[PDB]
């Protein structure tokens, strides 16, 4: 009989309902986002860091390090080789 | 697509104000027409019986 009032009801609840739940997950994570690279640490050094940084870094990602390792391995093996037989 | 939606709640409380206010208004404004209704049937009422 009179006029009720929907356009300003939106207070209670916030346009949407699936889309809902995904505002609080993705405007948080924007907050203590990195803007570009920010404290990359490629820089470090622990009497290993340096050989990390060289060879078992994502950039070369090669197979030399294992032969490297072998040939290590095997200059390592020689003396007790000799030592044994 | 949530944001381009949200843009449109900017400035409809500014108009509804006076859309609300004015509903009401004109509704409850016809208490004159009302009144000016059983004038208007006496009226007739007279102009018919001495047309009579």
């Known amino acids: ?85 | 697509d949530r944001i381009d939606s949200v843009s449109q709640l900017q400035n409809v409380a500014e108009t509804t104000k006076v859309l609300f206010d004015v509903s009401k208004e004109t509704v409850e404004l016809e208490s004159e027409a009302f009144e000016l209704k059983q004038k208007v049937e006496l009226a007739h009422e007279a102009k018919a019986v001495l047309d009579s």
């Open chain 1, 1 to 85: 009989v009179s006029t009720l009032i929907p356009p300003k009801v939106v207070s209670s609840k916030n346009i949407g309902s699936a889309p809902n739940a995904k505002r609080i997950a993705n405007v948080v994570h924007f907050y203590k986002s990195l803007p570009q690279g920010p404290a990359p640490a490629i820089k470090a050094n622990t009497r290993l860091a340096r050989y990390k940084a060289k060879y078992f870094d994502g950039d070369n990602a090669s197979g030399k390090p294992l032969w490297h390792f072998a040939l290590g391995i095997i200059a390592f093996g020689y003396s007790m080789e000799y030592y044994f037989h």
